[PDB]
Scaffold this active site. Structure first.
Site, PDB file in Angstrom:
ATOM      1  N   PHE A  26       0.808  -1.241   0.000  1.00  7.39           N
ATOM      2  CA  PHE A  26       0.000   0.000   0.000  1.00  7.39           C
ATOM      3  C   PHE A  26       0.837   1.286   0.000  1.00  7.39           C
ATOM      4  O   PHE A  26       0.389   2.317  -0.493  1.00  7.39           O
ATOM      5  CB  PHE A  26      -0.886   0.065   1.260  1.00  7.39           C
ATOM      6  CG  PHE A  26      -0.095   0.207   2.561  1.00  7.39           C
ATOM      7  CD1 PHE A  26       0.281   1.469   3.051  1.00  7.39           C
ATOM      8  CD2 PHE A  26       0.312  -0.922   3.264  1.00  7.39           C
ATOM      9  CE1 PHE A  26       1.044   1.603   4.226  1.00  7.39           C
ATOM     10  CE2 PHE A  26       1.067  -0.789   4.438  1.00  7.39           C
ATOM     11  CZ  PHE A  26       1.437   0.487   4.917  1.00  7.39           C
ATOM     12  N   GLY A  27       2.010   1.227   0.625  1.00  7.42           N
ATOM     13  CA  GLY A  27       2.832   2.406   0.858  1.00  7.42           C
ATOM     14  C   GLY A  27       3.547   2.347   2.213  1.00  7.42           C
ATOM     15  O   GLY A  27       4.055   1.280   2.622  1.00  7.42           O
ATOM     16  N   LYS A  42       0.353   7.271   7.624  1.00  3.22           N
ATOM     17  CA  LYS A  42       0.278   6.277   6.578  1.00  3.22           C
ATOM     18  C   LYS A  42       0.078   7.061   5.259  1.00  3.22           C
ATOM     19  O   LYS A  42      -0.861   7.847   5.129  1.00  3.22           O
ATOM     20  CB  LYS A  42      -0.892   5.313   6.861  1.00  3.22           C
ATOM     21  CG  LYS A  42      -0.982   4.092   5.996  1.00  3.22           C
ATOM     22  CD  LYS A  42      -2.072   3.095   6.455  1.00  3.22           C
ATOM     23  CE  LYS A  42      -1.995   1.804   5.607  1.00  3.22           C
ATOM     24  NZ  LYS A  42      -3.138   0.829   5.732  1.00  3.22           N
ATOM     25  N   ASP A 180      -7.755  -9.086   7.427  1.00  3.51           N
ATOM     26  CA  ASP A 180      -6.324  -9.072   7.140  1.00  3.51           C
ATOM     27  C   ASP A 180      -5.484  -8.866   8.409  1.00  3.51           C
ATOM     28  O   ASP A 180      -4.540  -8.056   8.436  1.00  3.51           O
ATOM     29  CB  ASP A 180      -5.988  -7.991   6.133  1.00  3.51           C
ATOM     30  CG  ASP A 180      -4.569  -8.147   5.550  1.00  3.51           C
ATOM     31  OD1 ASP A 180      -4.060  -9.272   5.495  1.00  3.51           O
ATOM     32  OD2 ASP A 180      -3.941  -7.124   5.258  1.00  3.51           O
ATOM     33  N   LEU A 181      -5.845  -9.599   9.466  1.00  4.49           N
ATOM     34  CA  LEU A 181      -5.267  -9.354  10.790  1.00  4.49           C
ATOM     35  C   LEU A 181      -3.966 -10.178  10.982  1.00  4.49           C
ATOM     36  O   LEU A 181      -3.780 -10.949  11.955  1.00  4.49           O
ATOM     37  CB  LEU A 181      -6.302  -9.559  11.900  1.00  4.49           C
ATOM     38  CG  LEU A 181      -6.086  -9.032  13.338  1.00  4.49           C
ATOM     39  CD1 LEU A 181      -5.184  -7.849  13.463  1.00  4.49           C
ATOM     40  CD2 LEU A 181      -7.461  -8.830  14.053  1.00  4.49           C
ATOM     41  N   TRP A 183       0.057 -10.437  11.885  1.00  4.54           N
ATOM     42  CA  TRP A 183       0.721  -9.923  13.088  1.00  4.54           C
ATOM     43  C   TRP A 183       1.450  -8.606  12.977  1.00  4.54           C
ATOM     44  O   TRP A 183       1.839  -8.054  14.006  1.00  4.54           O
ATOM     45  CB  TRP A 183       1.544 -11.001  13.784  1.00  4.54           C
ATOM     46  CG  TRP A 183       2.789 -11.518  13.051  1.00  4.54           C
ATOM     47  CD1 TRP A 183       3.086 -11.429  11.727  1.00  4.54           C
ATOM     48  CD2 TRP A 183       3.859 -12.262  13.656  1.00  4.54           C
ATOM     49  NE1 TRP A 183       4.283 -12.047  11.472  1.00  4.54           N
ATOM     50  CE2 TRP A 183       4.789 -12.560  12.638  1.00  4.54           C
ATOM     51  CE3 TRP A 183       4.132 -12.674  14.964  1.00  4.54           C
ATOM     52  CZ2 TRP A 183       5.962 -13.292  12.883  1.00  4.54           C
ATOM     53  CZ3 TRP A 183       5.308 -13.384  15.211  1.00  4.54           C
ATOM     54  CH2 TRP A 183       6.204 -13.687  14.167  1.00  4.54           C
ATOM     55  N   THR A 220      -7.701  -2.111   5.345  1.00  3.60           N
ATOM     56  CA  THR A 220      -7.627  -2.183   3.892  1.00  3.60           C
ATOM     57  C   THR A 220      -8.594  -3.240   3.302  1.00  3.60           C
ATOM     58  O   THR A 220      -9.172  -3.006   2.255  1.00  3.60           O
ATOM     59  CB  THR A 220      -6.190  -2.435   3.407  1.00  3.60           C
ATOM     60  OG1 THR A 220      -6.149  -2.225   2.006  1.00  3.60           O
ATOM     61  CG2 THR A 220      -5.697  -3.858   3.757  1.00  3.60           C
TER      62      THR A 220
HETATM   63  N1  LIG Z   1      -1.143   3.599  14.141  1.00  2.23           N
HETATM   64  C1  LIG Z   1       0.069   3.040  14.135  1.00  2.23           C
HETATM   65  N2  LIG Z   1       0.888   3.102  15.207  1.00  2.23           N
HETATM   66  C2  LIG Z   1       2.120   2.537  15.188  1.00  2.23           C
HETATM   67  N3  LIG Z   1       2.634   1.828  14.177  1.00  2.23           N
HETATM   68  C3  LIG Z   1       1.880   1.698  13.040  1.00  2.23           C
HETATM   69  C4  LIG Z   1       0.562   2.298  12.961  1.00  2.23           C
HETATM   70  N4  LIG Z   1       0.077   2.023  11.751  1.00  2.23           N
HETATM   71  C5  LIG Z   1       0.977   1.299  11.099  1.00  2.23           C
HETATM   72  N5  LIG Z   1       2.060   1.117  11.864  1.00  2.23           N
HETATM   73  C6  LIG Z   1       3.313   0.379  11.537  1.00  2.23           C
HETATM   74  O1  LIG Z   1       3.426   0.270  10.144  1.00  2.23           O
HETATM   75  C7  LIG Z   1       3.334  -1.111   9.758  1.00  2.23           C
HETATM   76  C8  LIG Z   1       2.550  -1.248   8.477  1.00  2.23           C
HETATM   77  O2  LIG Z   1       1.262  -0.708   8.615  1.00  2.23           O
HETATM   78  P1  LIG Z   1      -0.066  -1.450   7.966  1.00  2.23           P
HETATM   79  O3  LIG Z   1       0.220  -1.213   6.500  1.00  2.23           O
HETATM   80  O4  LIG Z   1      -1.337  -0.647   8.314  1.00  2.23           O
HETATM   81  O5  LIG Z   1       0.097  -2.873   8.287  1.00  2.23           O
HETATM   82  C9  LIG Z   1       2.711  -1.821  10.977  1.00  2.23           C
HETATM   83  O6  LIG Z   1       3.118  -3.175  11.053  1.00  2.23           O
HETATM   84  C10 LIG Z   1       3.300  -1.041  12.124  1.00  2.23           C
HETATM   85  O7  LIG Z   1       4.642  -1.474  12.411  1.00  2.23           O
HETATM   86 MG   LIG Z   2       2.156 -13.466   8.844  1.00  2.00          MG
END
Ligand SMILES: Nc1ncnc2c1ncn2[C@@H]1O[C@H](COP(=O)(O)O)[C@@H](O)[C@H]1O
Ligand SMILES: [Mg+2]
Length: 329
Positions: A26-27, A42, A180-181, A183, A220
């Site tokens: 996603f970014g 994000k 999409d939970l 870890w 997402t």
């Molecule tokens: N609200 C948040 N607080 C702290 N870390 C975050 C947060 N959102 C995303 N991250 C970090 O960014 C990674 C990728 O974000 P995601 O794409 O939403 O899985 C996560 O595994 C966290 O390490």
């Molecule tokens: Mg995994």
């Protein structure tokens, strides 16, 4: 009047303080400071014809469900009948236009040196590129990064209880599925609270924190109903989502597809049970605890979490697990 420049979301000082803390296809995710407090930003490239991290950029239409669900879930901390802090606070959403700020490029580079990156260096975006910028509450450190850092088996149990309760509250309030939970999407933050509070259909209960507040992020692929309207990511024609390997994570996408017969607008809260099973599996297989597992009490919790792993697939929802499984009595 349409998009804003990056400087609108990230003025000089805030930008200078950015450090990359995470990523996905996603970014990119950065941490900075707002109002004396860490925040997570994000940044998602949208609407562009160029392939980014191997995938087409989302259209605003494809990103809109995550934005909506992020807003809804952010309300659960204050709602009366069904309440939890187990998701993440949303501060703001912006559509930004421009090339990547050089400071964010340097932060990306720093991360790529230290941790490595699966993404393309974001140095190819043109002045007309659109991004969605989601500013979130800083939720702590992800469970994958904490895989050697949890204190005890009691901490494992607490995390599973918190996760299950959060999902149950969202099920009761919104007919929510996370979908999409992995870890990377379970955040841990130290708390001085001894007991954490949630309300499920007007009944308030507590959960021993073991020193941590769990926050579920990343909506997402999520699905919920709001004012009778189903908000979701339709993946009925996505092929690649279902052909992953190397991790049980990739089985869950196939297992969800089986459960819902490829009809993603329907409500199948069993998907939440599937993700909780995947997380339980990580706890049992990919984690080491600071206090190991050295006393009769801790050994019994481990056997209990093993039994949960082996039985939880016979429960219908996070709510069913919370309300009926022996692990949470
Ligand atoms: N609200 C948040 N607080 C702290 N870390 C975050 C947060 N959102 C995303 N991250 C970090 O960014 C990674 C990728 O974000 P995601 O794409 O939403 O899985 C996560 O595994 C966290 O390490
Ligand atoms: Mg995994």
């Amino acid at each position: 009047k349409g998009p804003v420049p990056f400087s609108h979301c990230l003025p000089t000082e805030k930008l200078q303080r950015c450090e990359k803390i995470g990523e996905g296809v996603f970014g990119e995710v950065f941490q900075t400071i707002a109002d004396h407090t860490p925040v997570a930003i994000k940044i998602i490239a949208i609407e562009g014809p160029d392939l980014v991290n191997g995938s087409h950029q989302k259209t605003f239409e494809e990103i809109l469900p995550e934005i909506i669900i992020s807003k809804e879930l952010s309300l659960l901390s204050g709602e009366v009948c069904n309440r939890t802090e187990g998701f993440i606070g949303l501060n703001s959403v912006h559509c930004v236009q421009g090339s990547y700020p050089p400071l964010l490029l340097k932060a990306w580079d720093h991360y790529n040196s230290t941790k490595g990156s699966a993404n393309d260096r974001p140095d190819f975006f043109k002045d007309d590129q659109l991004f969605i910028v989601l500013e979130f509450e800083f939720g702590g450190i992800d469970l994958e990064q904490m895989r050697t850092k949890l204190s005890s088996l009691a901490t494992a149990k607490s995390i599973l209880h918190q996760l299950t309760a959060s999902l149950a509250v969202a099920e009761a309030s919104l007919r929510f599925e996370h979908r999409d939970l992995h870890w990377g999407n379970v955040l841990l933050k130290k708390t001085s609270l001894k007991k954490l509070h949630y309300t499920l259909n007007g009944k308030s209960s507590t959960i021993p924190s073991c020193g941590l507040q769990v926050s579920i992020i990343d909506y997402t692929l999520s699905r919920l109903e709001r004012d009778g309207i189903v908000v979701f990511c339709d993946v009925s024609m996505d092929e690649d989502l279902f052909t992953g390997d190397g991790d049980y994570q990739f089985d869950i996408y196939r297992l969800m597809k089986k459960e819902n017969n490829n009809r993603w607008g329907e409500y199948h809260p069993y998907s939440n049970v599937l993700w909780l099973h995947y997380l339980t599996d990580k706890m049992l297989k990919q984690m080491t605890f600071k206090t190991k597992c050295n006393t009769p009490a801790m050994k019994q919790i481990k056997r209990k979490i093993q039994e949960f792993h082996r039985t939880m697939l016979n429960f219908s929802s996070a709510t069913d697990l919370l309300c009926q499984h022996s692990l949470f009595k």
